Amino acid sequence: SGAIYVGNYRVVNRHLATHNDWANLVWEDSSRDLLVSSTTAQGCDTIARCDCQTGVYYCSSRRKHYPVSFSKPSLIFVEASEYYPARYQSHLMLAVGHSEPGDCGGILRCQHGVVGIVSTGGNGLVGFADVRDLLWLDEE
Ligand SMILES: Nc1ccc(-c2ncno2)cc1
Ligand SMILES: [Zn+2]
């Protein structure tokens, strides 16, 4: 699990979204495994606006932060999960690293802020759903 809190937005894995996330839906993209819901409390997270390909992600299954190199956001084929069928995911970044289902929502960050959240795992790769292109997260 895990979320990004920026302004009056909550960003979560679409597959881990709650009924309150869906009842307060702002935006969702099944292709990206992202959902944004509205919050009453102001979020203090900063979204990275950059093209960094290095950063640090939290891995709950190891209670550790790992530094990783990651690919630029791409359309990647992702195998079947306990949450999705084997399909293409857009705006996905891969790194060599440890990712289990419960690691989803772990934040990836660079010097500029939040880059994305863990979304995919397996074959010794971790996929992160990019958020840096969602410029609208940083106003009203
Ligand atoms: N009034 C509502 C609110 C949420 C949901 C829902 N969330 C996830 N799946 O269904 C359904 C009805
Ligand atoms: Zn950056």
104 catalytic per annotation: yes
Resolution in Å equals: 1.6
- Only one residue has tokens 């106003």, namely 139
Nearest to 93 by CA among 71, 109, 66: 71
Task: Report which bound ligand comes closest to the CA of 14.
Answer: 1
d(CA 70, CA 116): 11
d(CA 130, CA 108): 9
Contacts of 95 (CB under 8 A, 6+ apart): 57, 68, 69, 70, 71, 125, 126, 128
33 catalytic per annotation: yes
- The minimum-distance atom of ligand 1 relative to the CA of 19 is 7
Chain centroid offset of residue 45 CA: 13
Contacts of 56 (CB under 8 A, 6+ apart): 65, 66, 67, 68, 108, 109, 110
